């Protein structure tokens, strides 16, 4: 029981990178478009706080 609950942690941690995707590759690409867009946006969303700190 203890070793099964111990080995659950890496298995569940790797499974956590799967639940955010619906089982539809077309919709997965459709929303990976805005995933790339929001990554590019939050690479710029940290910019204005640093700008207000520096100015």
């Amino acid at each position: 029981l203890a070793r099964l609950k111990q080995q659950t942690i890496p298995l569940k941690k790797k499974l956590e990178s799967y639940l955010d995707l619906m089982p539809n590759p077309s919709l997965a690409q459709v929303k990976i478009e805005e995933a790339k867009r929001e990554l590019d946006s939050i690479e710029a969303e940290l910019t204005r706080r640093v700008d207000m700190m520096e100015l």
Binding site: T8, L15, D20, L21, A28, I42, R49
Partner: protein, 53 residues
């Protein structure tokens, strides 16, 4: 009997994701990288907000 039921359900979910193909595996890796970078930016933003307070 609850424990290996939970692991069996997790393995069934992983297998159902693996049914879709290698393109969806690349999508899994890509979204994992994107969400890791996303959480890296989010944690930095939260830490800066906590420092400013």
């Amino acid at each position: 009997h609850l424990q290996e039921q939970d692991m069996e359900n997790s393995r069934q979910v992983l297998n159902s994701y693996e049914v879709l193909g290698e393109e969806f595996d690349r999508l899994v890796k890509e979204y994992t990288v994107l969400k890791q970078a996303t959480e890296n930016k989010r944690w930095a933003l939260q830490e800066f907000s906590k420092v400013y307070r």
